[PDB]
CSV table of C-alpha atoms and ligand atoms in Angstrom, one decimal:
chain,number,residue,atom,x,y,z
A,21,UNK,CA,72.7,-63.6,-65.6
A,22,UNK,CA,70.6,-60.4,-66.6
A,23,UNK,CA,70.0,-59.7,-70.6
A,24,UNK,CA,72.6,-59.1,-73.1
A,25,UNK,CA,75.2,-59.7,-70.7
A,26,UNK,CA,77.1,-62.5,-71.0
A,27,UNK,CA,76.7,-62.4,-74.8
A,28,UNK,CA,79.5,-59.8,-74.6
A,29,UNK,CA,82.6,-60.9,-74.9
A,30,UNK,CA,85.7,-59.2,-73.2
A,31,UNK,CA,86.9,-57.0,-75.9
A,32,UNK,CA,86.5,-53.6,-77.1
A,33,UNK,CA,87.5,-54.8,-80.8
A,34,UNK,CA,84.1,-53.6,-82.8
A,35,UNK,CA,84.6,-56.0,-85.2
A,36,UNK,CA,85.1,-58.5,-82.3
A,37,UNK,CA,81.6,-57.6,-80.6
A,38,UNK,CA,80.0,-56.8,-83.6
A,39,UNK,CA,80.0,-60.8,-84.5
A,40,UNK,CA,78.9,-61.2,-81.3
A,41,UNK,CA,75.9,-59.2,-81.0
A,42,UNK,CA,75.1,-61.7,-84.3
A,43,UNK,CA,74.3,-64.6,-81.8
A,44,UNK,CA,72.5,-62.8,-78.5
A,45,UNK,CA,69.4,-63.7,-77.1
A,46,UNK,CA,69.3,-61.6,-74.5
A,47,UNK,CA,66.4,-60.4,-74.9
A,48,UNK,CA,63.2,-61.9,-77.3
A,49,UNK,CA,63.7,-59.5,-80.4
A,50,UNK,CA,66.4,-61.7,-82.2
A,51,UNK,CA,63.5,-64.4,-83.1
A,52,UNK,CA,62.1,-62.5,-85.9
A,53,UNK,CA,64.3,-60.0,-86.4
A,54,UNK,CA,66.4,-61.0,-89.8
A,55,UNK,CA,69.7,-60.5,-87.9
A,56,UNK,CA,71.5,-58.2,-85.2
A,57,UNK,CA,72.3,-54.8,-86.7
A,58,UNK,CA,76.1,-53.6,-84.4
A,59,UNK,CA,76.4,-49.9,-85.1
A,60,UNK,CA,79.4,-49.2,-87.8
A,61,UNK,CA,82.4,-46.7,-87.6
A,62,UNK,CA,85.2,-46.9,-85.6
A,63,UNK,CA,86.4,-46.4,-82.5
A,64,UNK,CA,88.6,-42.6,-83.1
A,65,UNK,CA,85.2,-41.2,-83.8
A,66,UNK,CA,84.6,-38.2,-81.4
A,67,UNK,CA,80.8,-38.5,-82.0
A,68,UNK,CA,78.2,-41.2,-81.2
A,69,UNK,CA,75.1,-41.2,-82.2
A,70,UNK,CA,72.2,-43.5,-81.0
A,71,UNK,CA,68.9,-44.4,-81.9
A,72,UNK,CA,66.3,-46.5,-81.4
A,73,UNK,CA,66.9,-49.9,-83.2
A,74,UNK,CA,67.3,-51.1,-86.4
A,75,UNK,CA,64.3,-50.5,-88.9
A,76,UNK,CA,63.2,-52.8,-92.0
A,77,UNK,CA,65.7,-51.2,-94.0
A,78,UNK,CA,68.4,-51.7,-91.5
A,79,UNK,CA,67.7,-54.8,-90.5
A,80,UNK,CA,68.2,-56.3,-94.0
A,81,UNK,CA,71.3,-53.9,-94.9
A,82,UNK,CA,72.6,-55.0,-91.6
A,83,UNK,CA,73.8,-51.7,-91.2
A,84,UNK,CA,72.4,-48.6,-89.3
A,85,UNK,CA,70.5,-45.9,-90.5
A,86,UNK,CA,69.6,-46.7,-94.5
A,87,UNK,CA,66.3,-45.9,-95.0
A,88,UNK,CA,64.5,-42.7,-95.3
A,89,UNK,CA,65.1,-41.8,-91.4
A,90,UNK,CA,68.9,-42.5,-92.3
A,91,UNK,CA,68.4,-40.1,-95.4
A,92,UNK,CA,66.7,-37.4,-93.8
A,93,UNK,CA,69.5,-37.5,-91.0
A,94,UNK,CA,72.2,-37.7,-93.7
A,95,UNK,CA,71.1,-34.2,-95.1
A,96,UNK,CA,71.3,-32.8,-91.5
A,97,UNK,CA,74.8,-34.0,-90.9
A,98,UNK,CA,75.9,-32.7,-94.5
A,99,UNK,CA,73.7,-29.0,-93.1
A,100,UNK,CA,75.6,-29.3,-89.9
A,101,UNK,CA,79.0,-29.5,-91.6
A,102,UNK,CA,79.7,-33.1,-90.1
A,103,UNK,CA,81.6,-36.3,-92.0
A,104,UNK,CA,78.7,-39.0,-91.0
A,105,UNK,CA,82.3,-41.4,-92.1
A,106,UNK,CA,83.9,-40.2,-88.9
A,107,UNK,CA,81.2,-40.9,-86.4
A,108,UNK,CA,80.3,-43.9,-84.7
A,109,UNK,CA,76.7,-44.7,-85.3
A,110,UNK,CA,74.1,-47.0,-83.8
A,111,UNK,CA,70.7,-48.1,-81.9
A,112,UNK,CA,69.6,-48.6,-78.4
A,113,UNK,CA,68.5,-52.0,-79.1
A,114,UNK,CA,69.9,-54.2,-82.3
A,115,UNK,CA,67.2,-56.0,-82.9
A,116,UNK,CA,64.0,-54.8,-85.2
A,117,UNK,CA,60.2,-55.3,-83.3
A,118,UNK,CA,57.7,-55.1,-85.6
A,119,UNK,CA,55.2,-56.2,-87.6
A,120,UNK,CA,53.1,-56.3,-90.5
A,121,UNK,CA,49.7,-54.5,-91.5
A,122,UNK,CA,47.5,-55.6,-94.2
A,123,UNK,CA,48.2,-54.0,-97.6
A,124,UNK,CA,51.0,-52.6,-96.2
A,125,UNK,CA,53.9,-51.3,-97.9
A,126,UNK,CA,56.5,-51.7,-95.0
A,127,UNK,CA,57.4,-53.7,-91.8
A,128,UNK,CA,56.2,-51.2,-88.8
A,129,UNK,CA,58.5,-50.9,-85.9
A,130,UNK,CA,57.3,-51.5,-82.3
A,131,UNK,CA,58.1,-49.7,-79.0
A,132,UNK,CA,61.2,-51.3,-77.5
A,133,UNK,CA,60.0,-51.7,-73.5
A,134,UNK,CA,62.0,-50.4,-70.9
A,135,UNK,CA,63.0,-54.4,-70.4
A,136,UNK,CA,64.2,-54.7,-74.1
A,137,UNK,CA,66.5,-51.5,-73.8
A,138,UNK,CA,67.7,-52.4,-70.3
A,139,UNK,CA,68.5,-56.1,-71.6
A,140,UNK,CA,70.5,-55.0,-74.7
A,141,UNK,CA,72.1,-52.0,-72.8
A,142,UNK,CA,75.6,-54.0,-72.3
A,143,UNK,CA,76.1,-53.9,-75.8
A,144,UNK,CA,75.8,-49.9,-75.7
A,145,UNK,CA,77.8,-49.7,-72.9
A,146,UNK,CA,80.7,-52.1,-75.1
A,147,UNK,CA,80.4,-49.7,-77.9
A,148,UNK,CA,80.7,-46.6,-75.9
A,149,UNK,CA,83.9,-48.2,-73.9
A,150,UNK,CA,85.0,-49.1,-77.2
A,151,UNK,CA,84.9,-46.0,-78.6
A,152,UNK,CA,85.2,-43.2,-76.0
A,153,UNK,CA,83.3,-40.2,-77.5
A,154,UNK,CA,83.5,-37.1,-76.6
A,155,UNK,CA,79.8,-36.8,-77.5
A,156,UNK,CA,76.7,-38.8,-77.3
A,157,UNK,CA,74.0,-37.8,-79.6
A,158,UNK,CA,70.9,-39.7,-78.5
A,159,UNK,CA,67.8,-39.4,-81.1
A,160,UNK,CA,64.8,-39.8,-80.2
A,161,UNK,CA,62.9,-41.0,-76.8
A,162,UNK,CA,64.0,-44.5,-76.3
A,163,UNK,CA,68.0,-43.7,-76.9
A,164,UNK,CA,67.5,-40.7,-74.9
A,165,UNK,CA,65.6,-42.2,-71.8
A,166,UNK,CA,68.4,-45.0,-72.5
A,167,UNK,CA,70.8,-43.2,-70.9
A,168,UNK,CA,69.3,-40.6,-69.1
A,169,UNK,CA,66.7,-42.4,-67.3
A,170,UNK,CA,63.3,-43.4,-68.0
A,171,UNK,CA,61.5,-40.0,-67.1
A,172,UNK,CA,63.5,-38.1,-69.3
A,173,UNK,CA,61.5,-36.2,-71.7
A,174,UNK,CA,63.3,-34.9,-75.4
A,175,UNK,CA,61.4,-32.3,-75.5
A,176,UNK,CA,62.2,-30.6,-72.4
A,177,UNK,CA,65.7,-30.0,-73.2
A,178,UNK,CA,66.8,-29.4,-76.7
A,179,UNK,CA,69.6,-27.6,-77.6
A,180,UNK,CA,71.2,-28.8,-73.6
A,181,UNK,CA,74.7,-30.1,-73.0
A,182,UNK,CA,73.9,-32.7,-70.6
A,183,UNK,CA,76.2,-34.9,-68.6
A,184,UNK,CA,75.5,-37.9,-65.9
A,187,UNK,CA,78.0,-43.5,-68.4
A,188,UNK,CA,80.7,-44.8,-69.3
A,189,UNK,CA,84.0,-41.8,-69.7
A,190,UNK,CA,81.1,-39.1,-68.8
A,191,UNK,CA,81.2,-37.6,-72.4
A,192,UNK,CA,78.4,-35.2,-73.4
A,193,UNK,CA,75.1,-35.9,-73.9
A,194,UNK,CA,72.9,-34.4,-76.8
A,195,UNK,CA,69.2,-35.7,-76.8
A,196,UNK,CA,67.4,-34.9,-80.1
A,197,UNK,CA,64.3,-35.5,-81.9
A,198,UNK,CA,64.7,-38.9,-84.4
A,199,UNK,CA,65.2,-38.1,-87.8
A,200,UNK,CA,61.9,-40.6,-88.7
A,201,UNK,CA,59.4,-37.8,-87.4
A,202,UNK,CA,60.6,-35.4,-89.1
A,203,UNK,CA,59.8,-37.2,-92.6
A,204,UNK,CA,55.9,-36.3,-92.0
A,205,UNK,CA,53.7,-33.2,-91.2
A,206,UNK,CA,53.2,-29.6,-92.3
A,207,UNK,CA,56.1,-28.1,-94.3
A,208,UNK,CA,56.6,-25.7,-92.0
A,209,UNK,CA,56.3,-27.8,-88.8
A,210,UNK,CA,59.1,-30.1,-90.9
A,211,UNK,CA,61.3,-27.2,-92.1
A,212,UNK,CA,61.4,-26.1,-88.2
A,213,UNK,CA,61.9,-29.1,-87.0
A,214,UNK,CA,64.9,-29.9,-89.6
A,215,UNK,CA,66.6,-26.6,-88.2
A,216,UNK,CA,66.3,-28.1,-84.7
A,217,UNK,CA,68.0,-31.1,-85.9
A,218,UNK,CA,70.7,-29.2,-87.1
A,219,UNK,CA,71.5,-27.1,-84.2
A,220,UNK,CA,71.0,-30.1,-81.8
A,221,UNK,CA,74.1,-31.7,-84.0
A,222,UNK,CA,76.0,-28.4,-84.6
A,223,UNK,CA,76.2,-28.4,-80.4
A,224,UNK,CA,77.5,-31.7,-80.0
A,225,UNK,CA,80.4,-30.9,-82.6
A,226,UNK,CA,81.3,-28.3,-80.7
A,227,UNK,CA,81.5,-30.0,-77.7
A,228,UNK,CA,85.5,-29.4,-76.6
B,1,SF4,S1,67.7,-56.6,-79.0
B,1,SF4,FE1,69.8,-56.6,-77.9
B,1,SF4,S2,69.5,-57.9,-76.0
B,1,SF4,FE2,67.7,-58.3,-77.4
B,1,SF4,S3,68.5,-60.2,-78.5
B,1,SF4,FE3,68.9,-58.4,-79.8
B,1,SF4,S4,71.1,-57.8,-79.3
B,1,SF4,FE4,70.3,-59.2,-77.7
């Protein structure tokens, strides 16, 4: 009765759950978002990684992390000596909130609330069944409270194995690669370091 929930069906096929994330209304993102973006990979990846939800890019490639965020991440992976191919990759919520500003060049996402996240949750907790990772990578605030609770604070506890979910695997909360696109070069070289060595601990996980 609650969300996302009985959109799922009972299967831990990705495929399977993917088409079925295409028609959920469990919460009200799906009205104006283009479509439901399932996170891609398969289910012997050792890592997950979550974010926040689809962008505009995503949203219209209908895949997860395409657009400069997705870039910027990509070049951490590659830094980090990871195959982005063998992780499992995805958002918190699979529908985009945004919306427009005059003149502007881009759809702007919105804040998922706490509602939203909790509502699309089963999904997550289908993928991470699904796929059993050793690892949870969680970037940014809303993937991180996602799954560590809503006080949790990123900034608190970088570079910290943390563990509470589904097969208890590790848990890696991160900055999102989207702030680290703007700011002072040195504030965004430091940061991209950080980014690295938050992702070089999770592939070490054992
Ligand atoms: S954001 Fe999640 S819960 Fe809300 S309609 Fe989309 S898939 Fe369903």
């Amino acid at each position: 009765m609650a969300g996302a929930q009985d959109f799922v069906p009972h299967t831990a096929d990705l495929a399977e759950l993917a088409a079925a994330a295409g028609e959920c209304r469990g919460c009200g993102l799906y009205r104006d978002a283009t479509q439901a973006v399932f996170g891609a990979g398969g289910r012997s990846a050792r890592i997950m990684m979550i974010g926040e939800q689809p962008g505009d890019k995503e949203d219209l490639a209908g895949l997860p992390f395409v657009g400069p965020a997705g870039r910027l991440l990509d070049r951490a992976l590659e830094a980090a000596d990871i195959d982005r191919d063998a992780l499992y990759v995805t958002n918190a919520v699979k529908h985009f909130k945004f919306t427009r500003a005059a003149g502007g060049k881009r759809r702007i996402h919105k804040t998922p609330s706490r509602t939203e996240v909790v509502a699309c949750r089963p999904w997550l907790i289908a993928e991470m069944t699904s796929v059993e990772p050793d690892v949870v990578v969680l970037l940014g605030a809303t993937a991180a409270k996602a799954l560590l609770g809503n006080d949790f604070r990123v900034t608190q506890h970088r570079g910290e194995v943390l563990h509470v979910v589904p097969g208890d695997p590790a848990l890696v909360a991160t900055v999102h690669p989207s702030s680290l696109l703007r700011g002072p070069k040195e504030e965004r070289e430091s940061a991209f370091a950080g980014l690295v060595d938050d992702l070089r601990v999770a592939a070490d996980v054992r």
